[PDB]
Write a protein that binds this ligand. Sequence first.
Ligand SMILES: [Mg+2]
Ligand SMILES: [Zn+2]
Ligand SMILES: [Zn+2]
Lengths: 97, 195, 107, 86, 114, 209, 252, 54
Amino acid sequence: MSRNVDKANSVLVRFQEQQAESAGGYKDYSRYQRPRNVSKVKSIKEANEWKRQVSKEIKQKSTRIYDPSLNEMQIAELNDELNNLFKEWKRWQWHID
Amino acid sequence: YTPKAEMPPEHLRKIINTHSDMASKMYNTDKKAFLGALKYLPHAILKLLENMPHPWEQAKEVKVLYHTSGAITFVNETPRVIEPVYTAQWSATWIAMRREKRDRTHFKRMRFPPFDDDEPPLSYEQHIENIEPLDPINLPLDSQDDEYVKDWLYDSRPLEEDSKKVNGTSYKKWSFDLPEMSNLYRLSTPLRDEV
Amino acid sequence: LPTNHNKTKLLKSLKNTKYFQQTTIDWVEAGLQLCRQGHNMLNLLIHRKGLTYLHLDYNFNLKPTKTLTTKERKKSRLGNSFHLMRELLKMMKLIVDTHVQFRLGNV
Amino acid sequence: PLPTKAEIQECTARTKSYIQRLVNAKLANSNNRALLLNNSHHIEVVSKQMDPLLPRFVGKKARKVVAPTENDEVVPVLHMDDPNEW
Amino acid sequence: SERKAINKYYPPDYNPLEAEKLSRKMAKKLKTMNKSHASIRLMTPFSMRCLECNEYIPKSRKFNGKKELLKEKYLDSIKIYRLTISCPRCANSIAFRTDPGNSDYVMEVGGVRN
Amino acid sequence: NEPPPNICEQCLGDEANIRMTKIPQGSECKICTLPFTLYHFKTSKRSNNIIKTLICVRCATQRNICQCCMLDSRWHIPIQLRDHLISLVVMTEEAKNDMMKRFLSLKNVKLGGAQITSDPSEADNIVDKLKNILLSFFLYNSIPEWKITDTVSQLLSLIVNHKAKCGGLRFQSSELGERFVSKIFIIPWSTAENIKLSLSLNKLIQLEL
Amino acid sequence: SWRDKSAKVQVKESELPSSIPAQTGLTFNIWYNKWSQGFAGNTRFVSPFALQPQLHSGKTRGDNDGQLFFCLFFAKGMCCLGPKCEYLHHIPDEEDIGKLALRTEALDCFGREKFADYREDMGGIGSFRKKNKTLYVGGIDGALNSKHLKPAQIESRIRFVFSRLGDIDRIRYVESKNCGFVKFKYQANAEFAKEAMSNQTLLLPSDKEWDDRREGTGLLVKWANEDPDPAAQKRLQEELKLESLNMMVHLI
Amino acid sequence: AYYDLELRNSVMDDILEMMPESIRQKKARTILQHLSEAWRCWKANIPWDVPGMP
RNA sequence: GUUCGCGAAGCUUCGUGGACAUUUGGUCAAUUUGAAACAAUACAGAGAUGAUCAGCAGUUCCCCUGCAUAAGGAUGAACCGUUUUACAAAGAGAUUU
RNA sequence: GUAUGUCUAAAUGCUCUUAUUUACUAACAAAAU
Ligand SMILES: [Mg+2]
Ligand SMILES: [Zn+2]
Ligand SMILES: [Zn+2]
């Protein structure tokens, strides 16, 4: 399990995380992938967390896309990615509450 | 100047118990104290070990200093003995052990460690209340041969306080009569085996 | 050949303060206290160091919770002092543990 | 003149006292074992015995400190008075 | 605390099978482990030119690549891998495949061998 | 070697004997964050709460202040105020930085103004100069509510916006109000024209944002 | 009138004063009392208690003995000592302020060292360098559980909470910034208010979201960075001048 | 390494002592380089003869 | 409360003068706001030199682990950039007084 | 010797597959009769 990722997703760590989730309510919304279809999330806190995560992602995307080699295609691709992120964020701002 | 106040053990116990689940802004300084105490923890260990109750002793009471924070606890007394008496005691214990060995088909040797790595060592308050600690190692005596020594031989302070045979409770010097000495010598035949 | 000068032993100095007070205690009790106090010390120090992922058994055998990333490992390599202390504590526990057992009807 | 014997002795005493004092202070500082007035008003200073477990010198924490030179008076740096070879 | 650590501490209630099951349940949800292009450190055997900026990355030069499994194996039961690299100057994704028929590699829309 | 503590007369107390303990490198000074000896005294034996010194002697010297009060050694005024007065007749800029503050502390210049306060010559002169220099109901028509409240009390919840200038006092009792009216700055129930205009303007301003 | 109003206080009994931390992290660090090995959680949670001062405020063990400093816990609204508390339980009156006005430079009304530099977030116990009586209120969205209220209503609510807590100088709610500036007469009073209203809900019993006030995040009450717009500045300057004049008068 | 450093320092000091200079810091580096070269030559058994060297 | 004396009622009880003992503890007050770190996600990613790699130092208003004046930390951290004047002498041509 | 750095506002249970590993790390060391 060299290079840290393996360590992170080693069974023991996972178990610990699960335990934390069970007792006290420590989740790491960084750690899990954000769900595709909203309205399968009855809790508000979770939703908020997800929204926050997406915002963070968007910010990250923004930070990188103004790099100096602007003509490279990665940046262009991200522009679409950025849009997608924005859309997701908007969706997360649903009007149930 | 004026000596230390002999505190109650109860207070000490209470102090100890308080600093188990210690995680408030209350006792910030107690944690610091605890940290500091590592300095003297080996000393403490040495002390406690030194005071180990000998096999002729059910349970030794012992002098104790302790930081009011509850950070460290030193056994304070340094265990001195009447050398010949001590030797005699040891010999007796040895004899007893031998007898036990002779007796027993299998001798139930301890498992180590004695408590589990998960299980946190029981507080002393679970077994103060428990029944009289089972009998210790002291051999079967006789009135004819070992007439003099038997009464005190297996006592915590090998010779009693307030007697003319030792200095006193400080237990710093001893003077014996002949017959007791002789008895001791007889007892010590295993260990003192010298040319 | 020993110290000509030094009368002042460690305990005496401590006594001379107000922060220590003294009781008479059963030796097993004292041992137990030491075990507990010692354990606390080792945990407290460890937590201060930041490494919260090296968990102490109550038997004093220290070992890690997860498998530590390399940075964490670097942070949390305790040295020849701390380990020695731990070992000493363990030894104490073992003798103290045996006496506790004896006291209890177990042995 | 080579300095007066008495004077020399005095100097030695001064420095000896001072250096000794300094050494003592240093020793005190090391963590191993072994009256006043303000304005007109008189005031008694004390030193309380802190607990021997807590850090002796709780103030200090191995801080970096840049100091100013503070040289107000100006040093006179006085002096006197083929380039292709050198 | 030390790289050759014999036994990692477990909680007093740790049903190992149960724990494993739990992990599995929380592996589909997991971000890492449920993805492709897992990282790797590799030296470059081909010694090739980055097709965008013509940066001549030579033999044995070390990179933090991404190894990914190619689903279409060679023959039957011997896998082949895509090994992504970046050129030092321009950030163009070079990669290569390991077709073991010739005991060597194949370039994959990254650069050219020379 | 150590210099002495600079504690003021009002700081320290009113008595002819005080006992204090010195704690060498006790705490870090609040200004400089640099170890120094804490003096802490109890004023009167039995009067609760200690008075620990919060700053290093050097820093005190620089600012010319009580090591407890944080006030001018001479005039017993907050550093700003004392300095401000001097300026009126230049002020100190404590540099709020991890490293730089320490450096500043170690400098020995008497920062700014402190010199004037220290010397009888200069402080006195400054003082002289200063002397010379010296020698329910809505409510309409700036001043604080604690004054308004006081006024109301004298006359005998009290809302007041300032952008509006529209103070709606609500005693919630017909007795208090009817006493308030008889016992007596426009004050109706729930250059007059000019005032009205101004009020209107204020209201408009309030309402545009 | 707290003296003759009551003696007793007993705000939150020592059975239930507080649980110690709230689980961020995986493991609990014994030395810091803060969860470690992870940081996911906005952390600020709403106070379970509050200062209803008219009910609570009373004589203390401190009042009799002549304590200067007021009870932080009382302010927060959770002083389990109550009548046997050594710190004072009432809203800081003028006389009290006057009495501790010597010390009020170096330390707060709670008897705890004011710092030289402000905290970067202006978050707690103000500096001794800059005297202040002026509190930033924030997180009013969060403190009201994202309720669609009128700004005016919010302002009123703020006034209600803060007037009770101390003699007000002046208050401003702002729609654009989404905040509530408050200014007090006395710094001590302001400090007390801050202590009280840290992590407090602005909601009332009559509101429909009373039972879920705990689940939100409380008021973010902090110190006020001075208002830049010019009239305010001018006013401040005038005040300063007045103060200076007063000082001069005192001197001569 | 330490020894080498010390030697270098000594050499620099000697050179400073030797003759006048203006902006000598730059020249120090050059001197060091020269010394290094000389050492290398010695190691190799090349004669270290440079014409400009006074 | 102990008590050693005096004065009233029936050695017992009240009323008194003394002697004995005499100022603890806090640099701290219990949850967010007086400052712990790892971790995680994302993104890149490894000293010279063409490449790969060892070790040693050095500067610092950077530290960590280490009992350490061992040793170890990405070659432990940042150093790889900016870089126009103690600036004069000689010759030639041009506009202004 | 398992490097590193920036980046962070305050669906539920179910079972079935194994005589393995898309395994990762290379700082560590390098010869014949
Ligand atoms: Mg290396
Ligand atoms: Zn003062
Ligand atoms: Zn209280």
